[PDB]
Every structure is written in structure tokens, then in C-alpha cells.
Amino acid sequence: AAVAGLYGLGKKRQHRKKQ
Amino acid sequence: QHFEPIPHCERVVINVSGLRFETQLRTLNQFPDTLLGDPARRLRYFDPLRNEYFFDRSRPSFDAILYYYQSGGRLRRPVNVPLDVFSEEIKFYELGDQAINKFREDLFEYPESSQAARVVAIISVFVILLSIVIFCLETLPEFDPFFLIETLCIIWFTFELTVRFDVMNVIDIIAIIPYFITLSLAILRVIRLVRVFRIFKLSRHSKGLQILGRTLKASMRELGLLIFFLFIGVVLFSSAVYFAEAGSENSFFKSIPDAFWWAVVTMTTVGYGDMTPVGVWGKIVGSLCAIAGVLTIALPVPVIVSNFNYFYHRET
Amino acid sequence: QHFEPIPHCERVVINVSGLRFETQLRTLNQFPDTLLGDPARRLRYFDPLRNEYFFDRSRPSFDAILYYYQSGGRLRRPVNVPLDVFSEEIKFYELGDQAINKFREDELFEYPESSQAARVVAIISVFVILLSIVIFCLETLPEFDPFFLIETLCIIWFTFELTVRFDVMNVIDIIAIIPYFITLSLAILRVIRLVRVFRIFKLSRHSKGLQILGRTLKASMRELGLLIFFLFIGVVLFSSAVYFAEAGSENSFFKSIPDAFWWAVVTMTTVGYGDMTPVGVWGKIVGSLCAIAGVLTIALPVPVIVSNFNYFYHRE
Amino acid sequence: QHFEPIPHCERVVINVSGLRFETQLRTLNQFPDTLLGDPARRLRYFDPLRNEYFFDRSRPSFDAILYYYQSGGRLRRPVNVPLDVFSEEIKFYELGDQAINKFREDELFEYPESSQAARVVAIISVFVILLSIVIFCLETLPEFDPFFLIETLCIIWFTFELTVRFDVMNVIDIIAIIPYFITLSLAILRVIRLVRVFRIFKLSRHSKGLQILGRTLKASMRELGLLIFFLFIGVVLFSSAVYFAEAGSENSFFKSIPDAFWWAVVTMTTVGYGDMTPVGVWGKIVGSLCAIAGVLTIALPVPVIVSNFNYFYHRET
Amino acid sequence: QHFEPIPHCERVVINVSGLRFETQLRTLNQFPDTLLGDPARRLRYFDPLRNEYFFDRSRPSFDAILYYYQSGGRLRRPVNVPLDVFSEEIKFYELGDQAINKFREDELFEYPESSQAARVVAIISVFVILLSIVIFCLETLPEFDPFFLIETLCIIWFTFELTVRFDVMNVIDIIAIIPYFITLSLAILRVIRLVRVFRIFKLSRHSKGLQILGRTLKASMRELGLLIFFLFIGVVLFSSAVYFAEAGSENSFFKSIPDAFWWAVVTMTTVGYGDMTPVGVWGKIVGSLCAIAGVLTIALPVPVIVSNFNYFYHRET
Ligand SMILES: [K+]
Ligand SMILES: [K+]
Asked: Going edge to edge, which strands form the sheet with D46-47?
């Protein structure tokens, strides 16, 4: 496939995932 | 839009277990009822020695509770606490059933299985599977014995439907309409095809199938966008590949519609098979078609994926 | 770069509903105008009894407001509050039209507007575009005046709309009608009859999602170029490898490295070549490596484009 | 469910390095033992001059500590600090082994060792496993005693290792040696020769990634079943549609609905069927729909499986 | 591991613009130098009237600064502020060059440059590399001295650039010119005419994305090995299954398990084998299982490499 998985359910600069 | 209070009667102090809050009394007066809105439900928490409001509860969650008074109708949960604790904090002050519902939005044994209907359900699942098997087997070249099982399955289906009496009922009706129809060959082929809809009766018994249905209902727009992108790509690349090969003798593609299928099996990376009789320009067009197909499939699908993931975790 | 104040005249206290802030007046006087910059707009909130500034508002959002004075020009939204509260909070103090505008970037004539019962014009235009596409595809069929009349009616409608209207939309509008007027070596004829397909892009003015796709392409041109570069590198490398794996065998499947290019593509994008038997063991190993590397090089750059498309779609 | 105390005995103040906390003594007395639960372990931190509890440690993580007393048994780490700081934060107050253990779930025998003399045994074992796999795949060749000796040496080594050792690893080891002893209807012979391939799974004992894959499969059995169910639904539906599209045309490509199943599969997974010419326009439309729906149905459940694999992989490292 | 101070000399108060911090002087005594470590660099901030330390700076970021003293060696940026502001905060107090450096890791000779006269040299090198690749591809054509002159001009330019310049870049530059001088058993000839393709890797010096890809591969070599291992296991298993499905059938499509190996691959990667008719029902079932397992075993390892590439690409810009 090409999606290879999720996009992270949100990708913003200084996102809460990276916080 | 919500209304915020403006300064200039007397200001009161709130002590949430050491976190001191000071607000105008008019701000607390804005919302009637509620623990802090009226003096009747808050006089117990008064401290005569300190003239302070003492609320020995979670400190970080009082900011949102006060902000509801501050914003005069806007209640948003800050990202510092789980949702479980916030639901408990809001219930303490009794903000109001209508206010809590905003964040909420943020015989007959067949539906409710209770011991004995836990079997009826398994019999229904077995009968649905048996009907599917009979359908597939009777389509075989090697093949009354199938008709008897089919009519037994239909009798069970209609018995369940008539005892029961959205979309489940519609599917149940559709699963038995073609059998009663049999009691231009294009119509016959169409009804024999729509006989396959009995496979969707597993939605009543499969939790994942209902999740998929809800995901489709939620992301109809994204599905339409994906179909539109695919259609545009197919038209463009089929036209390009047809015009890249029209000038050669014994052209592989007779017309642009004849190339449509090819375009599809190149955008979805299914593959067409034989590809030799197409020249260099056709090969370049095919490479571009493959790349654009990967992009146009990877673009909108993750939104539907996200919707399905959310619905799956909400169910469990 | 921004400048911050340094200590050594008098300090003042700011009470944001119980959250006391103490800052040097030199910091407060750094920015002229504004609610806190000048004494005229902040004397109203002064408390003569306690010599304190009272601002009965959202406590957690004042940290960014003070930090803007602290950093002397840097205003960043902390990740603790929704966007709605921050936008309203900054408007309360009137930080400045330029300051708020800078933060915004951190995150007849009836045709263009589909209002005043002009949606009928839009649906007629969409129907004409679809009819033109269908007529083009059907006239490419081998089975075929009747098509020319419909095509020229569509061209008259398109040119009437373009002339009454008078960016990329206008360029597409012009290109959609150039080839018809051109026809009033055969390679140029083939090119113009191919570029006639650009009428499919006329749906951009009416389809919101296709504009999102165009904006995503504009934003991720760099990633698209990187993906094309990676695909070219992989195709060249694996085509050379597979061709040299068959050099020593008679009746070679691939006559030359360029001949293998197409094959590499359908292995890099996992589309499929079809017949694969006359390839030896070394060619099969090279093909497996090509498939894996193509999967890798396709999966590497597509998430960026997917994220851009998702961001644009959910911002729209 | 947890119980929270309600107000009306004496109130005390807690000073976490300047961050003042005020809490009723009844809330503090709810939990016995612990640094703050009993006067024995908290009188040392008393300040006679100010009548205050002084705790010169991390300010932001004390909110969860007090909330544990506030909720009377509910302890969750707020998302403002790393896990390392919060893990050591609890150990200071000694809330209890059971409380800490509950939070943990919120986020000869010379062979099973890593000694210098044990790595050689491991490398010999993995070499023997690889040699057995190679011998299998070579003895299946058309061109072919020499293989039997190598196979019996590998079997002897496997039995010796199993006997020295004496879940699922032992089951795999048993299966890897059963067929050789079995040889000492042709369908049974074919089945045993097929199950001989399970020797490849013995690499799980020596491969860290393979155990991660096994744990991921065990965790996501439900998602795997959902994916299989969706595939089955799609295959049945699209095979039936494509068969009935060619019902009215002579020389039908698909003789029956089951015959089309394979086709449906290699269209849902985008593998590809190959020749497609004798199929009419309706069959092509059904095939396009099948390809799109297969892409969607294979894309839907795999995020959960890959997230589980990511979680297990990062937990291992 | 870090050491935390314990209570029982004098306590001091820190007023970070209204946020009062109270800590033991021993905690401030733990780290020498620094603005707060020694009286010399902090006396200016003392307030004689209030006996307090006043720092008119950011309030939310002082918690990490105090925790460095609190934890005695641990500095973690709390997730409430961007890295830009926190980088300036640590510089204000001058925690120490070693402390700041440790946190950094937590998150003529004109040819190797970019000036007005170096740009033309770079564009010339890129053009020469592209020309060499084109000459290679066209000299492999069946329709064909004229190519040798262009080849030797490219080689002279390559060796001139290498000599002027004088890791991995120099290795690639060397390998790009070894085969030309080698020419001055046909297996070695085939190997050298194959390794001539390495000239295409010289574009790394001029392409920023290619270096990002190389860094991603270096970082995720472990994940690449895991993916290769999973593919090998799946190929062996499914080749064995599909071969033994046709073992008892006459006119078997697959002669041996290695013969089926290729098939397995083009089913795990969903490339497609092509003709599939002569395979029976059991072979088709095995093929469907192989397709599903290949989808799974490809979707599992790739996202880690995807994350590494995204991180490197966004760190570059
Ligand atoms: K594919
Ligand atoms: K394929």
C-alpha cells in the first residue's frame, strides 16, 4: 500500500503529540 | 457567540484547595441555579472565619468551570486532565442538564439477547451463512435439494421479520423480496443478483459491520471526493494513452472508453497484464498514470480511515 | 530576533482574577497604545483600595499576553486553550492591528458568486462541461455533424461565459476553447486534439475539493519533485541491474536498459508487468529488490502530501 | 468508581516549594501508611515557625498526588511531565506497592542466558535452524542420503536442545521435531511434509523482532478477524456481481460464483488477475468497484495493527 | 541517575514576576557558577526591601529551571512552551556549557561551497553526471567511439573534481571512476559494467533530498533488516504451502519450493504474478492468505522508516 498507516490523527507544528 | 461580563457588585474569593480565585459576584449571578449560581447551594461551603469559598476538589479543572461563568455559556475542557475526571467535576457543581448535554453531544427478545435469545441469535447467524453457502453452491455448474434449503431459510427470515415487526429492517425486507418475486431476462438477472443482499443481515449480529456502516455514513463526502478524483484521473490518462497510440498501426486501444478499464487498473495498482504492444509514449503515460493513481488513492482514504478508527474506539 | 527588558522604576501588580502578575513598568511601557501600554486605557481597571490591576478574565491565557511584553514582540499561543478563547482574549487588550494580523498567518458578474438564484447558471455550466466530456469520449469511439453541433454549442457557451466574466481559472478557461478555434504535420493536430481534454479541469470553478487538490499540489510541488527524483533513481538503478543480470543469457528478455525502464516502473509502484517467466534467478532477485525499494520510495514522501491535503481540506 | 470526601476536621496547608496546597485532614487520613498519610512519616517535614508542610520537590506533579487523595483511589499522570519524573515522584511519598503496581499497567539452564559461553550455543542453534531450512528447500528440488544425514543431525540437535531445556515456544519446538519421528493415504504424508516447515518459527527464540510480531498478532487478533470478515464480505459480493454480469453473455469468463472468488481476491488486495479481455463492460465496472472497495477495506483496520506493533517495538527498546 | 536534596539551611524566595518559588539554599548551593548558583551573579536581583529574588521573565518556564536544581542534573523541557523560548531561558541563567550541550542532543577549495562562482561549477558537475548517465543508458541500446569520447570526458571531469577535493561521498566518487580505469571470465566484466551505474549516486552531493534519504536509511537499517527478515519468513512459508498444495496434483505449476519463491514475493508485495489458471483450489487459498499476510508484513515495518524520513526532512528545513 501507500498510506503505510495513519497520519497521526493530526499533524501541526508543535502538535500535542510532539509536546 | 457568548456574552462576557464587564467591570464597573462586590467581588468574592474562591479557594479551590489553595488555588485562590477572585471573581465579580455578577459573574456568578449570570447563571441561575447551579451550586455557585445561587446562595442556597453554596452557603454551606462558606468560611465565616476567612470569608472564602472553599472547594476541596481538583485544582486544574476549576479553570474551565470558572471560564463557563467567564464566557457566559462557553464550556471547553482544557488539555490537562482526562475526560473521566472532567465529567465528575462538572457533576459536582450541577451546571445544568442542558449545559451537560452540550458535552454529551461533544416477547421481543431478538434485539436484547438474554440467555435464551443468545441462541436464537446463533441460529440466525447459522441460517444466514447457510443461505449464502446455498447461493454460491447453486451457482456452480454441477447443480430441488437447494430449493428446499433456500425456502427454509426464507421461511425463517420472514418469520423473524414478522415477529420483529431504519436500515436493518430494509435489508431484512430486501433479503426476502426476490424469493417472493419468483412466486425480459434482464429483470431476472437483476433479482438473482440482488439476492446477494442477504449477506448484509450479519450487521444485526456483527459489531464491526455496524462500525463500517457508520463510517460510510460519516464519510460519504470523502468517498464522493475519492470517486471524483478517480474519475478525473481515469478520463485524463485514458485520453492521453489513446492519443499516444492512435498514430501507430494496430493500436492497442480502439477508443478512449476502451482505455478506461486500463486506466483504472493502473491508478489502483491492480495491473493490466500484457503491455508490450504500446509504444514509448504510452509507457510514459502509463508511468504517470500509476504515480498519479498512488497519489489520488493515498490522498482522501486516510480521512475515511480516521473516521473508522474513531468509530471503532468509540464502540469499545 | 526580539529584545527583552533588563532590570535595574516602580513595579506594578496585575490580578487576572486571582492570578497575580508582577511586572516592571518599563516592560508595560515598551509597547505604546494598547489597553496596558498606556495609562489612559488601564486606569479604569485600577483598584485604589489595593493598588492592583484587576482583569476578571481567563487566567491561563494571560501568560501569552504578558510574554508578548516580556519578549518585546513575540506572541505565541501556548497549547493549553482553544483557538476561540485566545482570539477573543487578545482583542480585549487591543494589542495592535499589525500584531493580531501577524498572528493570523501563524495558523452582470453572476458567475463567480452562487447566490441570488444564480445557482442555476452554475448547474447549467456543470452540465455543459459534463456533456462536452461525454461527447469527446463518444466521438473517440470507432462507431462514429451531430457531434460537431453539440461540441460547437458547448464552445459557444464556454466562450460566452469567458467573455462575460472578463489566475489559473482564467488560463484553464481560455485553454478549454483554444483548440476549437485552432481547427478553424499531423503531430500538432494530435497535440491539440489531446489538449482538448483540459475541459475536464473546468470543474475546478465548481468543485470545492478539486481546488483543495490544486492547492495541495501547489504546496507540495517540492515533495512531488522529490518523489519523482527518487522514482527516477530507483528505475535507472534497477533497470541497469536487471539488464546486466540477463546479459550472459541467450534470448534476453530485456534488449537494453531503457527497454527495462517500463518494467522497473511497474515493479516500483507494484503495478505488475505480467509475463515474467523468461527471467532467470538473478533477474528475479533484482525484481524482488526493486519491488521492496519501490515500496519504500513510494511510502517515504507521500505522507507529507497527505498531511497537506488533509490540512487544506479540513481548513476549508 | 471512587469515593471523594465531603466537607463539614482541622485544615492543614501543604507547601510544595512555594505552591501552597490546602486540604482537609480527613482526606489526608483516608489512606493509611504513606509519607503524608500518617503523622510518623510527615512530622519530620513540619515547620513549627509557620505550621506548614514543606516539600521542596517538583511543583507540577503534586496535583496528581493530591488528586489521588481527593478522588480516594484514582491516580492518573497529567500530560504536563515525562514518565521518569512522575515515577520517582510517587516513590518519595511511598503511596503503596499496590497503588504503584496498579499504575504500572496503565502504560543448568545454560540456554536462556547471555553469557560468553551461551552466545556460541545460540549461534550454533540459529545456524542449525538455517541449515535445516536450506536442506528442506533444496531436498524439494527436482534434481534430488546426503540430505537425510543433515536432516537427522538437525533433528538430533533439536531433540537434544529440547531435552536439555526440559507457553508456545515449547509447542513450536515439539512441532519442529514431530514429523521426523512420524516418518519412522498420501494426504497425511503431504500434510506432515507441509508442517515440517514450522522449523522456521524456531527463530522466534533468537529473534527479538519475531517475538514482537507474535505479541502484535496476539493483541490484534480481533482486528485480524475483522479484516478477514470484511475481505470475505467483499469477495462474496463482488464475485457474485461479476458472475451475474456475464450471465447473459455466451462463453462466460467465470463459470460460477466460487470460480470468481480468486479473481475478487486479487482485485481487493490489488495483486492483479492477469488477462481480463473476455469480460464485458459491466464486468469491468464491477471490477473497478471491487478494486476501490478492496483498497478501502484493506486500509481500514491496519492502523490499529501497525499502532500495536509500534507500541510493542518501542516498549521492547 | 541523579541525586535529590533532602531537608533537615536557610530558605529563600524566588519571585519570577509574581510566581513565588521557595527552595532550600542547599539546592541553590548544589550547582556552582550559574546566575543562581553563586551570590556574585544573583546579588543584583536581590530585593533589600522584600528579601526576595525578582526575575521579570517568563513564568511557566521557570519550573524546568528549578527542577534542574531540584533533580540535581536533569533538564527536561516541559510541554507547555515552544523550544525557541526555552532556549533563551536557559541562556539567561547560564546553567553551564556542558548542561546546555547535553540538552542540544535531546532534540582555494571553493568546490564544496555555494557562492556566485561555485554555483556554475556545481551546475556543470550536475550536467556532467546526467550526461554520463544518459551515455550509459544509450550505449546499452542495441542500435550501437562516439560514446567512448563522451564517457572519457566525463571520467576526466570526475577525476579532476576528485583530485581537487582531495566518509562515504569520497567512496562514491572513487567507485564512480574505478570501472573506467579497470578496463584499461566474463563475470568480472559483467560486474564492472554493472557497478558503473554507481555514478548516479554522485547526485547526492548536489541533492538535499538524497542525503536525507541516505540518513534515513542509516538510521532505520534495523527496521530494514526486520522487514527483510519478515519478508524472507513469509516467502519461505507461503512457497512451501503453495508447493505442497500442488504436490499431489499432476502437471504441477511449481516444480519446487525455490521455484515458487518468486511467486510468493510478487504476492506479498502485491505486484502480481500474471497467469494464475493452472493452480487448483488449495493453491488459490494459499495465494489469498499470502496476499493478506504480505499486506500486513509490508504495512508493519514501513511506518518507522516513514517517521525517520519525515523527522530528517523536517529537521533539514
Ligand atoms: K499493488
Ligand atoms: K498489482
From this structure: D19-24, D11-16, D52-54, D46-47
